[PDB]
Amino acid sequence: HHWGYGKHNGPEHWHKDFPIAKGERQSPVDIDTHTAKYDPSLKPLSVSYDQATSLRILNNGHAFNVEFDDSQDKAVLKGGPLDGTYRLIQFHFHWGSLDGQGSEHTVDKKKYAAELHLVHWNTKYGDFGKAVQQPDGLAVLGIFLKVGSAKPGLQKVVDVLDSIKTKGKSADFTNFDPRGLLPESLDYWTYPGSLTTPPLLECVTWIVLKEPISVSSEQVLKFRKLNFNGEGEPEELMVDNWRPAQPLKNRQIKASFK
Numbered sequence: 001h002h003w004g005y006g007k008h009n010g011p012e013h014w015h016k017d018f019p020i021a022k023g024e025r026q027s028p029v030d031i032d033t034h035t036a037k038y039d040p041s042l043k044p045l046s047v048s049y050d051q052a053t054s055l056r057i058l059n060n061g062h063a064f065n066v067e068f069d070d071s072q073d074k075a076v077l078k079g080g081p082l083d084g085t086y087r088l089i090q091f092h093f094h095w096g097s098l099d100g101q102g103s104e105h106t107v108d109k110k111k112y113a114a115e116l117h118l119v120h121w122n123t124k125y126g127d128f129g130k131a132v133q134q135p136d137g138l139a140v141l142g143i144f145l146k147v148g149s150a151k152p153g154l155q156k157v158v159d160v161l162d163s164i165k166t167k168g169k170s171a172d173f174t175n176f177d178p179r180g181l182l183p184e185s186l187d188y189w190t191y192p193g194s195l196t197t198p199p200l201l202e203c204v205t206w207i208v209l210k211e212p213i214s215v216s217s218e219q220v221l222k223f224r225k226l227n228f229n230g231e232g233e234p235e236e237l238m239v240d241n242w243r244p245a246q247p248l249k250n251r252q253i254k255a256s257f258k
């Protein structure tokens, strides 16, 4: 009886195994655009992905991760609200059964069809497992997906998903350039929060871009053909793998822009 996204093991249950689920800095949150304050002190954001080394794509039973070589400073995030250097380790998405839901963050209670998380860890903690134990251990870059025009830079991901249909399957996934998943603008909101899946650790500086990327109906339909189950288990489509908005509590969402 492991955590997941069903009726019996979904987000409303997680607090029983992971009591931090009801903590003071949980994610995701609703971004109230009228309440978020421009912070002129935010340094410019630096996304340096030119040397990124992708290795593998993995269905982990909750989502699929595109994993990077993080054994040196290649692909890094710096600036914005961050002190120091954060190394890209993986990206993944959350998505819906229908185009009207799927994002974890919301904007004035609007849900997007999906949300991309580019996960980075603070190099001053030496490894990812040490970084998740620290309040400034991770920086997750969150990007909304809406359905419209295809995202050309996403199609290499869409085309390998047939090869990792079920939980525990992986495939080689070299030379993928995550710059092809970015919108034009790097304007963002930022707040202190958590991982959005168990173990729900309060270790994340969230950086959520205001400009969504557009993906096609056919691209998101291929995400929804993935399976939560393992091979030779009953088929359960990998859809609605999102946690809903959590209470903001004693936090302020800061805007990088006027």
Ligand SMILES: NS(=O)(=O)c1ccc(CCNC(=S)Nc2ccc(I)cc2)cc1
Pocket: 117, 119, 128, 129, 132, 140, 194, 195, 196, 197, 198, 199, 201
């Ligand atoms: N949705 S999200 O963006 O907030 C998100 C991001 C990341 C995670 C991965 C948690 N893994 C952990 S805690 N330990 C771990 C430690 C070392 C290694 I190498 C692998 C695993 C979860 C959720």
Ligand SMILES: [Zn+2]
Pocket: 092, 093, 094, 117, 196
């Ligand atoms: Zn995520």
